Design a protein around this nucleic acid. Structure first.
Lengths: 52, 61
DNA sequence: GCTTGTGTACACAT
DNA sequence: ATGTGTACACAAG
């Protein structure tokens, strides 16, 4: 799981989304803020489905 | 689950990440390409754990 | 009589 | 040194 800061994610979002499409889970971090994870919709939906 | 295009996400990423922190699940769609979902790490990690607990005891037979 | 994506980029303010 | 907003461009679909 790659972990990138906000500035990097905004300037390289296309490359972020390409990695995500390839199955990768990308963590976006901000100073003093909780991290966010960008994941393929299909993967996300499968996880939630299995959880439910 | 809100759903936005790529141009909106990049131009307003700070605003998206704020909504995500508030518990919101945001779908990002590039024209004709497969969607990505931005979700709080905590939520994501909880979903994965619950997914892993589901297929555990059953395995193997 | 257009639309979205992608890439650089500057210019505060924290 | 990183976030956040503002102009964009320009090019590609």
């Amino acid at each position: 799981m790659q972990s990138i800061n906000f500035r990097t994610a905004r300037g390289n979002l296309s490359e972020v989304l390409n990695n995500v499409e390839a199955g990768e889970e990308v963590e976006i971090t901000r100073r003093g803020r909780e991290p966010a994870v960008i994941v393929s919709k299909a993967t996300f939906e499968a996880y939630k489905k299995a959880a439910l």
